[PDB]
Structures are given as structure tokens and as C-alpha cells.
DNA sequence: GGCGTGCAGTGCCTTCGGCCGTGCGGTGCCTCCGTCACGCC
């Protein structure tokens, strides 16, 4: 059914990772942010509840929002909309999974919660950059960080998606036809993510 | 005069050290094809 009254109130560290390659257009990237913010207003943001991070990843990653930013939610969504279209020739899934592993989850800020890397991808990084890919995926598995591949478009690295799935059982993936189908699964996605978090005592 | 190796990594272990390995860009499924500088014999 369609979600009518949804407001994820659980203990969750949620990280948004946005493919910055030219595989997506300006507007197609604008829709991606639409999907993001639309999902943000469905979450209880608080340092004691649902924390969120936002990262655009090209050949290198720019973090618009950190988990500990401790700003106001109404602006956290503001930032997410002002995310610039990079259209780079390279969106390194390895590098960003690296960044997430060593930068975001270097320390465990809150053991009691669940961590989720929402990998919104639509491209294939150069093959030579995939060297230590599994390494990063597994490194996250050990730090108890779920990874959720979102396959947008015909160029979404199918191999890496399945490769990620294999690593961890709770590494379910969503394979979409385009940025269009993104909205059509807002409920099913947001639900899965939220329902994977522990509701506080 | 052909070869056969190259080397990333907050790598790894027995570390004042050595070994495992996508040498490298770039295409478009994939972990690879098709390349080029280097030494060595």
C-alpha cells in the first residue's frame, strides 16, 4: 500500500551518496535530489535518533552535510537542494565507499544505532579504480554498515551492485529503470531503510 | 632484439627489511583490452 502517515522514528545513521557523473543530466540529477529531500522530511532528524549525511561523489567526494552538522532539519533539506550538478566523467564508487569508511565511520559515534550507506549510482567507474572495491565494502561490513545499491539507468554498474549484495545479506539492492522510477518506489525504499533500524527503548 | 615485468594499498608480516599484485587509460559488464616504457638475457 501507499504510505499515508510515515515518520521514521528509530536509531539510524543514514548516509546519502550521489553519483556525480554525466551519466545523468542536470534535471535528472535534480530529480535525484528531489528524491533525497522528499525522503528527508520523512525522518526524525536528531543526534539521538535519525542522523543524516549527504555526499556527492565524482573523482573525489564533496560532503555537503556531515552526520554531526547539528544544524536545523529545515536547512539540512535546503542544502540538499543546492547540490550542484557535476556531470563529471568519473563517479568513483570505490573512492566514496572509501571516504565513507575512513571519514564518516572512522569512529563509531553511536554503537546502538544502525548505519546505512545509500549508494545512489548510475555509472561505471574506470576499471582500474575498482582495485580495492570489495576491500571497502567488506571494511564497512565489519563496522556494521549496511550498503544499499540503487541502480539508476542502463549504465548502473550491475557487476558492482551484485558484488555488494553478495558481501552482506542485508545488502539488498534496488534496480531502477531511470530517475523517473525513483519516486515510484519512495515508500518501498524509505520503508526498507527505516524498518532496518532499531526503535529506541 | 625478443622478451617479461611494471604496481594500489590510512595493503599485509618477522620490518631499518620483503611479498601480494588490475604496470597504465579508458571502455562500458568487468574485473578487462590493448596498450607502452623499461630493464634483462
Burial class (CB in 10 A: 0-12, 13-18, 19+), A148: buried
CB A149 within 8 A of CB A161: yes
- Residue whose CA is minimally distant from B33 C1': A127
Total residue length of chain A: 201
For residue A19, what are the β-bridge partners?
A: A57
Q: How far is the CA of A135 from the C1' of B13 (A)?
A: 19
What Cα–Cα distance (Å) separates residue A133 from each residue in A8, A30, A92, A118, A181? 31, 28, 10, 16, 27
Nearest nucleotide (C1') to the CA of residue A125? B28
Nearest nucleotide (C1') to the CA of residue A106? B10
* CATH placement of domain A1-201: 3.40.50.410
Grid cell of A138 as nine digits = 567488506
CB A99 within 8 A of CB A55: yes
CB A18 within 8 A of CB A182: no
**Per-residue CB contacts under 7 A with strand B, chain A residues 156-185:** 156-160, 163
CB A50 within 8 A of CB A43: yes
Burial A50-85 (b: 16+ CB within 10 A, else e): bbbbbbbbbbebebbbbbebeeeeeebbeebeebeb
Q: How far is the CA of A140 from the C1' of B29 (A)?
A: 24
Grid cell of A112 as nine digits = 546502538
The answer to whether strand B lies under 7 Å from the CB of residue A134 is: yes
- Method for structure elucidation: X-ray
Three-state secondary structure call for residue A163: helix
Amino acid at each position: 500500500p501507499p504510505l499515508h502517515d510515515f515518520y521514521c522514528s528509530r536509531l539510524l545513521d543514514l548516509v546519502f551518496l550521489l553519483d556525480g557523473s554525466s551519466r545523468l543530466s542536470e534535471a535528472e540529477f535534480e530529480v535525484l535530489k528531489a528524491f533525497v529531500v522528499d525522503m528527508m522530511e520523512r525522518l526524525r532528524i536528531s543526534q539521538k535518533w535519525v542522523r543524516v549525511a549527504v555526499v556527492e561523489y565524482h573523482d573525489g567526494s564533496h560532503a555537503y552535510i556531515g552526520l554531526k552538522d547539528r544544524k536545523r532539519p529545515s536547512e539540512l533539506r535546503r542544502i540538499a537542494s543546492q547540490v550542484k550538478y557535476a556531470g563529471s566523467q568519473v563517479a568513483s564508487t570505490s573512492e566514496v565507499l572509501k571516504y565513507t569508511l575512513f571519514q564518516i565511520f572512522s569512529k563509531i559515534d553511536r554503537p546502538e544505532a544502525s548505519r546505512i550507506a545509500l549508494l545512489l549510482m548510475a555509472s561505471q567507474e574506470p576499471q582500474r579504480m575498482s582495485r580495492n572495491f570489495v576491500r571497502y565494502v567488506q571494511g564497512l561490513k565489519k563496522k556494521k554498515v549496511i550498503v544499499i545499491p540503487v541502480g539508476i539507468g542502463p549504465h548502473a554498474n550491475l557487476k558492482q551492485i551484485r558484488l555488494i549484495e553478495k558481501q552482506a545479506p542485508e545488502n539488498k539492492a534496488f534496480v531502477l529503470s531511470s530517475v523517473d522510477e525513483l519516486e515510484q518506489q519512495r515508500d518501498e525504499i524509505v520503508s526498507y531503510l527505516c524498518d532496518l533500524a532499531p526503535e529506541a527503548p
